[PDB]
Each structure stands twice: as C-alpha cells, then as structure tokens.
Amino acid sequence: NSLALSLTADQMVSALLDAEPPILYSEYDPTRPFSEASMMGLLTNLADRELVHMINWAKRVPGFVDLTLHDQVHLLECAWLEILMIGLVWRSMEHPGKLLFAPNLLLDRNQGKCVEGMVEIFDMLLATSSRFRMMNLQGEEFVCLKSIILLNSGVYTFKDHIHRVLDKITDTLIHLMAKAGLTLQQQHQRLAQLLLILSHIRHMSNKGMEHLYSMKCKNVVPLSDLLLEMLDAHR
C-alpha cells in the first residue's frame, strides 16, 4: 500500500508545492548576442543542472518512491524534456513573447534562429506560455500537471498503482478548481483544457528530442554523460 493515496487534496498540493525545484541561473557573461555554439552551450549547461534538481523533485512526488528503481528510471527517461519544457513555459508566463530560461537568460524568437530548427519549437513554447497566460494557470495547477507528466508519459511503455495516483491527482485538480469558485461545467471544461495541452507538450518534447539527437550527431557542443544517457533510450 502507498502513502500517496491516503493523502488528502490539500496534503497533495502542499507536498507538491514544497517539492518545487528552484529557478537556476545561466552563466553570467553579458554577451547577449549569441551563436549556435554559445546558445546550446548555455542551454545544455542549464538543463544538466536542472536535471539534478528534477531527479530529487521526482523522489518527492507522492507515489514515485513506491516504484521500483527500474520503473523510476523509465519514467524520468521518458518525461524529462517534457518536464523541463513545462517548467520553462510556466516561468515564461509573465514575459509574453519571450522564454525565460533563467532570470538572467530571457530570449525572444529572433534569438532562436541561431540554432537550426530551434525557432520552430521556440514558437510552440511561446504559444504554450501564452495559452497558460490566457487560462490564468495557477501554481497549484502547474505542479499537478507536471507530476501528471512524470507518471503518465512512460506508463504505457512497460501497473494499477500509477493509475491510482493519476486519479488522485485528477481529484486534486478538481479540488483546486472547486475552491477557486468554478462551477461543475467550468471544472470539467478546465480540466480537459489543461490535459489537452499535455498532448502538445508531448509533441514539443518529441520534436525537441529529435533535434538534441542531431546536435549530438553534429557535435556542435560537448554533451555531458548524463545528457547523453537521457538522449539514449529515446532512439
């Protein structure tokens, strides 16, 4: 039996909020003009460090520690880029037209053209952020969505435990929407809207993974062993 199921809705929210990773900084060189090599250098260094925080965040996701080590490896391997992307989109909300990779690294789409194929995924990320902005996505909603991605994205490449946790998070999302005053129809409509964005986040990760694999093949920037291992098991 898992402790996550005995948690209440508020206990679920607090646990997720308390486990939020911190917002990291990029390197502090003021060269705002970027090249393809310096662009991907800053991003891979940033994402490597975010990955370490993601893995410790994952262990704090209710129900995630109840899984075997192999199952935990599989979910993180499948979901890591998705989780980075929804984090990026989330913290880019209050900066329309730009992507806040770090507080000291705020990029617009003209800078995405430095890397081949970045601008296409850039625009999708901007579109997702504006979508969150128009929906007024709350932080309590965000942390639920992110944990959903962690437990959902790899569940079908393997059992009732994860699905019981997924239902629990759905209960939590509705609980949050009921507190904010939404009617019954507004509750299930908003739930559906939030979950459909997850299909696009999955799409952005797939296309993003393809391009990180080409950057590996192009050897534009040296990749870490940890990033290379995350890139593997996707090919």
Partner: peptide, 10 residues
C-alpha cells in the same frame, strides 16, 4: 550502469 541509477538512490 546508468548515472540516473546513482542519482535516484542518493
């Protein structure tokens, strides 16, 4: 062996 294995157990 995977680095991810080491990081999850720590």
């Amino acid at each position: 062996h995977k680095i991810l294995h080491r990081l999850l157990q720590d």
